[PDB]
Amino acid sequence: TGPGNRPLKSLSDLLKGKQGRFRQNLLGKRVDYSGRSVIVVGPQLKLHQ
């Protein structure tokens, strides 16, 4: 127990994958060196561009 109505976490719970009885989404580390944005058409552009 502690304060804050909320359970505990052994070493067993620090397991990254730790899939028990269900194969949830995976959700690893969110790498680097990208950029996001909304997308738009390039109708003037070539295919490879």
Binding site: L26, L27, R30, V31, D32, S34, R36, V38, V40, V41
Partner: protein, 1111 residues
Amino acid sequence: NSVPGAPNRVSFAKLREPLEVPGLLDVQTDSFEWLIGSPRWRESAAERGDVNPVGGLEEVLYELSPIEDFSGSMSLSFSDPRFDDVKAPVDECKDKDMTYAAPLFVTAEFINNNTGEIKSQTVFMGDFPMMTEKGTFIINGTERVVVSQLVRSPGVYFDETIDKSTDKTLHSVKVIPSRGAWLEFDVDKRDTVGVRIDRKRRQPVTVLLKALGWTSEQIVERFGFSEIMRSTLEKDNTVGTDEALLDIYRKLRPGEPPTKESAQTLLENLFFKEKRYDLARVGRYKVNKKLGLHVGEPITSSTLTEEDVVATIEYLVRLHEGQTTMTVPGGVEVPVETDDIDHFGNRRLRTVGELIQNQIRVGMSRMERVVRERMTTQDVEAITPQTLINIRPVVAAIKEFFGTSQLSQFMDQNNPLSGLTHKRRLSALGPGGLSRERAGLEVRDVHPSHYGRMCPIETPEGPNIGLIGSLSVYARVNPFGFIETPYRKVVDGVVSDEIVYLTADEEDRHVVAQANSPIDADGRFVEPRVLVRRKAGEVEYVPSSEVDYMDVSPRQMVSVATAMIPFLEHDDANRALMGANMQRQAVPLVRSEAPLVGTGMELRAAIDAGDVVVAEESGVIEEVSADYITVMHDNGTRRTYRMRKFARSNHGTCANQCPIVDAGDRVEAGQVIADGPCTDDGEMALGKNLLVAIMPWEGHNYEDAIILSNRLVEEDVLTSIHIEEHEIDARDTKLGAEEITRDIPNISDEVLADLDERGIVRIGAEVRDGDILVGKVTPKGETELTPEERLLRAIFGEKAREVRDTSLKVPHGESGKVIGIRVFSREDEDELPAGVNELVRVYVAQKRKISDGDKLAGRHGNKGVIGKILPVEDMPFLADGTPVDIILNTHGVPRRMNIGQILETHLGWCAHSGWKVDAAKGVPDWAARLPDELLEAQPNAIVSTPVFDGAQEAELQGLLSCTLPNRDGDVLVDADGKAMLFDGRSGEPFPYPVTVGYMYIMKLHHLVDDKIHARSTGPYSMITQQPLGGKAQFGGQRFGEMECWAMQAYGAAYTLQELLTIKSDDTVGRVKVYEAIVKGENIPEPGIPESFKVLLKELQSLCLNVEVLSS
């Protein structure tokens, strides 16, 4: 009409509704005032009976008083929950961040039962928050919104799931009370009783009856036709009351010695001692009403009665008997039938004051269980309730409720519309409410009782559909948490004119046809065979004698936002809901023009919207200003009205208020005086009115791709204001006190230019991302310098300045002037949090032009991103040289089922054009029943249509036939709504006429800059080694499971390895690669991952022999 500043918008009302719009905010006002118990509410509830007007607080007093020791030697009591005035004005409370509240005084009294002496005090219960006049609350200056949560009430709940394995209906009941225990009267597979109770696993009814003081004689007497009853009483296999009592006691406390007095002294406490087993008063009401038991008396005594249980059993057995209705002795016959958890008749509504009282009860519980604690430990004949009182837990609960609650949420003020929409919101998830996955999909469904009560259209389209909606417009609330709905009762083939606020249950009793009915001008009707809603929610041609209630009006099943899309009955609910939820995402432009076309909603919406200042008293104007207006009340008295100008919303949008009148003017009470942001001429305004064609042009309008002329840009027609606030504190470290100043560590001078004299920058200065905001500094401590740095200092004569440079710089992608500086200082006696001494907050605005990529959408769900900002000249345009505004793609129209936008476009062209229908040879037939003075139209006059009462296409065609020329002899559009156009690029006319017209559109709160973001290298983790995610900081994009497995599919491995090593975990390798890039050299090899080794150590420390073998 019926509005003073109502700008003349003609509409197409073919009907006439008796009642007008209600007070949309009453949903919150009334709950709040009742919880208050204000005399407003006092007369209010008194208007419809309500012999005992009791406030929720009064209820809490009566449910708490008296307060007495278990010995019963001494007695405490309360009285007069009395509010004190608020400690500060709402504006001041918001600005200085003091939560707008007010004290609480109670006439509490203690008396010693031993001898009897009054201890009356008027106790400060605590400062108590006060609702806004916009029905909201300000916490610490912050502005939240409470939500009303849907819950099916506690009640006697019936069902017979047929055991198909037995092929037998299994009638059952679960009477779930508040603060109580459960119980089942089950139709077992055998001809027996499912008398499992309080989660016990099983009982015979006979055990209850003899336990209830009933002989088998008494039972068969009371239950002669009771077949399973007689069977079980033959199989009761136990005789005598106390035998049943002891069996119950042992099976209830198994692992416990049975005692005889616990026979009555447990069950009566379990189910009749109304101190630990108490469904709500509304629960008792539902009980009697379902059962007609307490027919003519007010509700009380949440404890049960054997009367209740026996009527229960009788109805249950008869339901599993073949029955229609049974009148209990003392009760009218209730129709024998099941129950529904989904149907509103069980699904009540915990209101705001409801939840507040719940918190009050839970706090006062703890407080009384400590008062009774001290009640003995307190010294006798020397205490006072002041000595007895602790308001700390109660105030704690209050605070932790206003803050720290998914029902106490931030008012999304992006515009008056969505502000309103946030209120009047309906959700069943929450504390007590079901969580997300625990609810079955069926609760998301649209039960036919929903009709006219909860608009089936408006709801979040994410993974919460069906979980949250809003109210129908003309809906109204039961004091018991139900939907009391007005209805037009018809009598004798003649609709009366008496509005009838009805719930859903009684509705099932009755017969309601449709408002769109051929009424014979008098309540009399036209045809016999009439549509009508069935008690099963079904429709037929009733012969026109049978109905007793007609619809109050059309659109009684619409939401607010849903009430604001013309032609709505022509397009699919899908794009409908899409545009609906989007329309709350509108963004207030700076010009705020009103649409040519609309509904009747656009004015009432604002007049409840509030943010548009309303004329309080009728009067002549005194003097105006850009910031306020002096108002001459008609007799002497006067007043000002402080315009809110450039007030930062909860989303960076401006909140100006411009006045709309003159100081020599004279207006009337309840009248518009100054539009708010999205308000134009008093009514709503969420965009502009634009002429568009629909061709596929150059592919640039490909798959929702949306093109734009430069003309709007250079005309500022799409122009947003944004208000980003920055704040930083003056803490104090072990190294000393944080410092703010122009004095800096190593830094340029020009970078120290636009600061003030004492750190912070100067008002009105332009800025750009990374620039310095505030010159702040703290000591860093002491470490041995590098010999190199020491050398640079030596050659350069440069001091140490161990105080570290900790200033405020603007984050990325930000610019615009700084309007106002908000500064706080502990030295100034500014109250600040501990470990702080000075606070400053900054306000920058940037007049964002419209730009490509941003998301626009009409009022149809028809939406999309900005394809490309094209110049004006290179544009398809009229024969009058008038360029088009934008172009949409036809191909999205059919498959989306959104012809209403086409309707709107034709209508808007007609509206801009103006007509004058030649009623020279009588009237053209389509115009026959059409309202007069539509026979012409001044160009660019404003009009509107009721949702279900809109113009017909034939009407529109007859209009479009009448399309008087603009300036010259100029019928620019055919009778088919198309026209010939010219490519500003080609030079030629296009081969065909083209659909065109004026459409009103919005701008969404999803600007490009809000989303655009990239990154190479930034601040690495603390737990892991990893440079921070989150676009608030840099952040970036997570390359996880989908395109890994993918890259493997491609077969390319090295890129994946590089990503997962040198962009993921290799501490040394990261700087290595950075070096290699800086030097222009071949990449180093990917080192070992870090989380790998971390997991390795973990597995080790799990007491696990672990090891790799290289060979």
